[PDB]
């Protein structure tokens, strides 16, 4: 599923991401835009052999099991394929664990490089929330 910008914002809000650990909703929408272009089916392979999955590009090195990243962890206790669903519940629940691990949203490279320190509220502007 390719979400619309406001559609995703409302889904994220419903799942408890607005101001989760101090990160306003705009931060999450901006991250999803630059990580996956709002596409739940996005995958990208990393140099170390791990793969990033889904709308928030969660990495199989630490967070999910894809059966092909030897010596990796599965801290979210889920198959990586679950992160590709049109239902974003699994991605959100795992993202909540990631953002709580001490490094905040800096875990997401595109957030650090393209959202951090910008006017992120622009990403939810005009949305019925
Ligand atoms: Cl933080």
UniProtKB/Swiss-Prot annotation:
Q: Which reaction does it catalyse?
A: Hydrolysis of (1->4)-beta-linkages between N-acetylmuramic acid and N-acetyl-D-glucosamine residues in a peptidoglycan and between N-acetyl-D-glucosamine residues in chitodextrins
Q: What class of enzyme is it?
A: hydrolase
Cite the active-site annotation: 35, 52
Pfam families, per database record: Lys
Q: What is its main location?
A: secreted
Where, by residue number, does the polypeptide cross the bilayer?
A: none
The domain of life for this entry's organism is Eukaryota
For this record, an example GO cellular component is: cytoplasm
Q: Where in the cell is it found?
A: Secreted
- Enzyme Commission number, as recorded: 3.2.1.17
Question: Which Gene Ontology terms describe the biological processes this protein takes part in?
Answer: cell wall macromolecule catabolic process; defense response to bacterium; defense response to Gram-negative bacterium; defense response to Gram-positive bacterium; killing of cells of another organism
> Ranges for the C-type lysozyme domain?
1-129
Listed as disulfide-bonded, the cysteine pairs are 6-127, 30-115, 64-80, 76-94
Which GO MF terms does the UniProt record name? beta-N-acetylglucosaminidase activity; identical protein binding; lysozyme activity
Q: State if Protein transport is listed as a keyword.
A: no
- Function statement: Lysozymes have primarily a bacteriolytic function; those in tissues and body fluids are associated with the monocyte-macrophage system and enhance the activity of immunoagents. Has bacteriolytic activity against M.luteus.
Also noted in the record is:
Lysozyme C is capable of both hydrolysis and transglycosylation; it also shows a slight esterase activity. It acts rapidly on both peptide-substituted and unsubstituted peptidoglycan, and slowly on chitin oligosaccharides.
Q: How does it assemble?
A: Monomer.
Family listed: Belongs to the glycosyl hydrolase 22 family.
Q: What is this protein called?
A: Lysozyme C
Organism in which the protein naturally occurs: Gallus gallus
**Gene name tied to this protein:** LYZ
